[PDB]
Design a binder for this molecule. Structure first.
Ligand SMILES: Nc1ncnc2c1ncn2[C@@H]1O[C@H](COP(=O)(O)OP(=O)(O)OP(=O)(O)O)[C@@H](O)[C@H]1O
Ligand SMILES: Nc1ncnc2c1ncn2[C@@H]1O[C@H](COP(=O)(O)OP(=O)(O)O)[C@@H](O)[C@H]1O
Ligand SMILES: Nc1ncnc2c1ncn2[C@@H]1O[C@H](COP(=O)(O)OP(=O)(O)O)[C@@H](O)[C@H]1O
Lengths: 75, 370, 370, 370
């Protein structure tokens, strides 16, 4: 009796939850495009020590020479 | 020769080719009275319709048979139809091809069902249904023009160019003054007035049309109203009550510019129309400023033309010369355009006969109605 | 002053009050109007027969009781003056307006004039140092502890459904129809009118109220129960009126869910309810269908929750079951929420200082009303 | 070093981020901004109004979606600032921008101004030690290992094909057109509009998105399967609704090849791809058929590539050898290749020294980047 005789206007006997009952791609047939089985370390060893050098790494839309192709120095 | 019947969820009209005034003019709403349980004598009609229902509006409840194109019951709609025919013209449908209208966004099954029953029930020789906007610019006098429909429950921006147009360019929001009627009725309820039945709706739509003028900036207008309440005009109803409103009057159509009054996650009529213009050619958009054609029955309110003009004026550059075409008769003009359409023999060579549905079925409805 | 503030509550049928810390409102005082039945032959009597509780139980000769706030719609205020005045009098809480701040709620969908008049009393006549006005369902939520949930409740003459998630609710999504128990009492006596009994004044109305809340229940199959057979038990008044009732003892859902069968224009709690829920976010709607706060101080009958479940089953997207919530007593939850409200930091940022009222009043009332 | 390079996988639809060596997907999330939608005063609610995540993908009717990104180009950079702050969260980042290197993705051919504004934030507001941004195509190729490559892909708004071999960029050979999934949603909605199903809200938009990545498959025959008779089995919706299959689901991606039906002219994805092949050389063309690219998460469809291969049959001459996968995660693939890329030795030269950005900035990066 927290407030039974005290206050007769407070809720009880209420099942306000509203229940229910327990009642519970890879079309590779085509020949469209391949994939590669990821192995980050394999590709890491693939691109292992490419000493690419960026001498004059310029790719602007400048017009003053013949052509521009950076990422060119090697070992 | 023909059978011209303009339609509308409210205003439904009729007559024939060459006629300038629609013979049939009535509210196309379905009235359902208070059928109670105790006995009574001498009876009445099962459910009076529009004018029939308005005559005895005290019991008859004119609920909507359509909802922004969503026809509730085809049966009741036919009752409206049949009685209207045998109320106004009293002519059989086998006389001439019929003429009716519709608007987009409608599932093709509705227009198919429509025409299907039109041949079923009526067995007309031929028939035809079109788009209101076509008759609008058709009666206007252009093949290149952007208009917008503001009926009782519809809104749609139609840009045309030499007759050509694009469905992608034509935009649509089927929202209109009925929503405003709801908004206005509830805010006046907040003011302290009772509103339960459909007669409440009728009186408020009445005074709504009687007071929805268009001012410019509600901030200063509101400031002047609170300052001087002289704008708060009074009006005595059929009942002894006399209400006084000033803001309410013109601020009710401001929701057309702002969905914020209803919180609709939408855009203003002006910017919506602007985007419709944006779906075009840079040259023809200029023509839209030139062909700023206006329609819709809920555009019989003074001031908004200058408003929308100023809106797009702030939107479009100064070089875009605005040329608003504002016909104050656009409401009836669709029916009139239908009559003019019914006057061009070539169009009356193009038809939808019996055998088309009898054999072809309803696919010709998709490729022949428009 | 840092005393315990007065927490006045409200109610169309049962109005409450209290302090920030009371766990029980000391008086379960109903909302009514004590008056004389005839012109008192001798002057200098119990002026207006302002009677409360035992004073109302004192005599019955020249005593006509009414309501000063019909179904939440309050019209006059002199009765309210004396009622509040009696509360202010040192028989209720033995305190003053100035001695304690006052918390109070208000029913929605009301004109501002009500708020105007009340604040005029509370600051002009009586002097509240810090007041406040709020809602009711919010307080009920605080009592239940939920801050979310489809709130639903129904007072003595006011019914309302408010969809809520974290307190948020759209006014468009908020629905309310003010019709409950008082008219049920009117119809109980109307049932007995068909049965031929005593019908002269409010005394019988009191009797019928005692019946309604005492010698009345609600069944589930009115067609079956109407076609069934009972011997119709009776009651004993101070006269000992052994009167039989029958179906009329439980003919109330034809007022709750089907009041239109009394040739009336309404919908049904469940209908308007579900519609308001449908105004929300469909998926959030689905989630909140599992948590629908059900309440109501008048909805105190067995089986009616099952009838509501039947409405649910007819309206829920089937197999998404929603069982019965059966809260028996629903009164003080609002009073409890107000006690918890004023007991927290809330009123400190939510008061209405008398000074600010003196400065602006209605301006401050509505600038701080939300 | 503890300062692990922060990989950022920003795409149109799919958007992510990452780190070097940490192969596995860190944190997935969508590409928009979540604004609040309604008000209240009641306690028991979350505030901040910038809501992204579970509450965003939970309280859809309480938060609106904001896409400042238009085909990979954002207009309101402050939204990205908030997005990046959501990234900066120590529930998301747990670190500081100024303490770690940063790599980022970008679709090519975008205006430099975007990059400028981006780097302004990325260095001025956040003194990031190292930063480099590149093409997702490159990252994908690094993930593959083929020096060759014609990256054909689409996010949710951009079609693009990148022919390359050993990193050799022929900008005249590379092509793109801003179109993908956003219009797929729009066209889905268009069919809904054709059948009366208005789903315009931000919440409604995600519902359509669920339909998109839920109710879809294909057919190698356009009209041969289009002119037939469907079945349209209904499907249960997250509201409790159930709507038909519709042939439209597979009809929608054909708009990618027939955009004239939507109105704008284009050529055909595979056609522009062939044009790139034509811009290449005879010898390399054989390798082009040998070197095919599985890219774009939108491509997830049944018999997708089958139909595209048939188009190739209709275009390319004989002796065409094209083959297929067993794809793992076409999406993450790019980001993964970038993570491995971020885990490289000589990769240190690829960034931008912030000090140089202070000195010159953008233009120097533009010339240093491709
Ligand atoms: N004379 C008028 N003045 C102001 N408003 C009007 C007037 N006549 C009609 N309206 C408005 O138009 C609507 C009534 O319908 P309307 O006259 O546009 O024909 P309709 O039935 O809408 O045609 P449709 O349904 O085909 O669009 C109402 O919203 C009303 O406010
Ligand atoms: N057992 C009952 N059956 C029907 N109605 C009742 C019962 N008990 C109380 N009521 C009515 O319900 C009302 C309580 O609802 P409430 O939320 O308190 O509204 P109010 O505050 O206006 O009284 C009481 O005023 C009373 O008239
Ligand atoms: N099953 C599916 N059907 C259709 N579209 C999909 C499916 N799965 C993913 N998508 C879309 O594909 C896009 C993924 O493309 P992606 O190559 O990741 O570019 P981005 O990173 O710009 O999105 C996403 O926008 C996503 O919405």
């Amino acid at each position: 009796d927290p407030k039974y005789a005290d206050l007769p206007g407070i809720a009880r006997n209420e099942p306000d939850v509203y229940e229910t009952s327990d009642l519970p791609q890879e079309e590779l047939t085509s020949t469209s495009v391949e994939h590669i089985i990821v192995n980050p370390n394999a590709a890491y060893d693939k691109f292992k020590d490419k000493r690419v050098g960026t001498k004059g790494l310029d790719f602007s839309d400048r017009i003053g020479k013949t052509k521009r192709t950076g990422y060119e120095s090697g070992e | 020769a023909a059978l011209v019947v303009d339609n509308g969820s409210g205003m439904c009209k009729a007559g024939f080719a060459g006629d300038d005034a629609p013979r049939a003019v009535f509210p196309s709403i379905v009235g359902r009275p208070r059928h109670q349980g105790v006995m009574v004598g001498m009876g009445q009609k099962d459910s009076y319709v529009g004018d029939e229902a308005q005559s005895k509006r005290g019991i008859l409840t004119l609920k909507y048979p359509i909802e922004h194109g969503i026809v509730t019951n085809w049966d009741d709609m036919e009752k409206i139809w049949h009685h209207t025919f045998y109320n106004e013209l009293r002519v059989a449908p086998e006389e001439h091809p019929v003429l009716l209208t519709e608007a987009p966004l409608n599932p093709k099954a509705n227009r198919e069902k429509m025409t299907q029953i039109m041949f079923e029930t009526f067995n007309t020789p031929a028939m035809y249904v079109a788009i209101q906007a076509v008759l609008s610019l058709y009666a206007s006098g252009r093949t290149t023009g952007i208009v917008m429909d503001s009926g009782d429950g519809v809104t749609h921006t139609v840009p045309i160019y030499e007759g050509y147009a694009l469905p992608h360019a034509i935009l649509r929001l089927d929202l209109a003054g009925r929503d405003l009627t709801d908004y206005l009725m509830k805010i006046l309820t907040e003011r302290g007035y009772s509103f339960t039945t459909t007669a409440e709706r009728e009186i408020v739509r009445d005074i709504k049309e009687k007071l929805c003028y268009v001012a410019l900036d509600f901030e200063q207008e509101m400031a002047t109203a609170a300052s001087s309440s002289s704008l708060e005009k009074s009006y005595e109803l059929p009942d002894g009550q006399v209400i006084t409103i000033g803001n309410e009057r013109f601020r009710c159509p401001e929701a057309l510019f702002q969905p914020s009054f209803l919180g609709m996650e939408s855009c203003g009529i002006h910017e919506t129309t602007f985007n419709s213009i944006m779906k075009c050619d840079v040259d023809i958009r200029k023509d839209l400023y030139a062909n700023t054609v206006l329609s819709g029955g809920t555009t019989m309110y003074p001031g908004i033309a200058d408003r929308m003009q100023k809106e797009i004026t702030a939107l479009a550059p100064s070089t875009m010369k605005i040329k608003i075409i504002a016909p104050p008769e656009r409401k009836y003009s669709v029916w009139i355009g239908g009559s003019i359409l019914a006057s061009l023999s070539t169009f009356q060579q193009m038809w939808i006969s019996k055998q088309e549905y009898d054999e072809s079925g309803p696919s010709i409805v998709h490729r022949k109605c428009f | 002053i840092a005393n315990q503030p007065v927490v006045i509550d409200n109610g169309s049928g049962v109005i409450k009050a209290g302090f920030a810390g009371d766990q029980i409102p000391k008086y379960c005082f109903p909302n009514y109007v004590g008056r004389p039945k005839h012109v008192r032959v001798m002057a200098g009597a119990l002026e207006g027969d302002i009677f409360i509780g035992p004073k109302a139980e004192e005599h019955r000769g020249l005593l006509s009781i009414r309501y000063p706030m019909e179904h939440g719609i309050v019209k006059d205020w002199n009765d309210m003056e004396r009622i509040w005045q009696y509360v202010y009098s040192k028989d209720q809480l033995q305190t003053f307006s100035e001695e304690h701040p006052v918390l109070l709620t208000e029913a929605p969908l009301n004109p501002r004039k009500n708020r105007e008049r009340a604040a005029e009393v509370f600051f002009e006549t009586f002097n509240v140092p810090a007041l406040f006005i709020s809602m009711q369902a919010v307080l009920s939520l605080y009592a239940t502890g939920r801050t979310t949930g489809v709130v639903l409740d129904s007072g003595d003459g006011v019914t309302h459904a408010v969809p809520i998630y974290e307190g948020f609710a759209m006014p468009h999504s908020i629905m309310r129809i003010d019709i409950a128990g008082r008219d049920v009492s009117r119809f109980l006596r109307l049932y007995l009118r068909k049965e031929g009994y005593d019908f002269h004044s409010s005394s019988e109305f009191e009797i019928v109220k005692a019946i309604k809340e005492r010698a009345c229940y609600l069944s589930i199959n009115p067609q079956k129960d109407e076609t069934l057979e009972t011997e119709k038990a009776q009651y004993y008044l101070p006269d000992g009126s052994t009167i039989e009732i029958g179906p009329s003892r439980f003919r109330a859902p034809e007022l709750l869910f089907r009041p239109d069968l009394i040739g009336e224009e309404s919908e049904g709690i469940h209908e308007v309810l579900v519609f308001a829920i449908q105004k929300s976010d469909m998926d959030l709607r689905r989630t909140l269908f599992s948590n629908i706060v059900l309440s109501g101080g008048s909805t105190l009958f067995k089986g009616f929750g099952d009838r509501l479940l039947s409405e649910v089953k007819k309206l829920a997207p089937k197999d998404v079951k929603i069982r019965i919530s059966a809260p028996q007593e629903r009164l003080y939850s609002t009073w409890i929420g107000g006690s918890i409200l004023a007991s927290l930091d809330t009123f400190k940022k939510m008061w209405v200082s008398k000074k600010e009222y003196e400065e602006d009043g209605a301006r401050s009332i509505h600038r701080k009303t939300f």
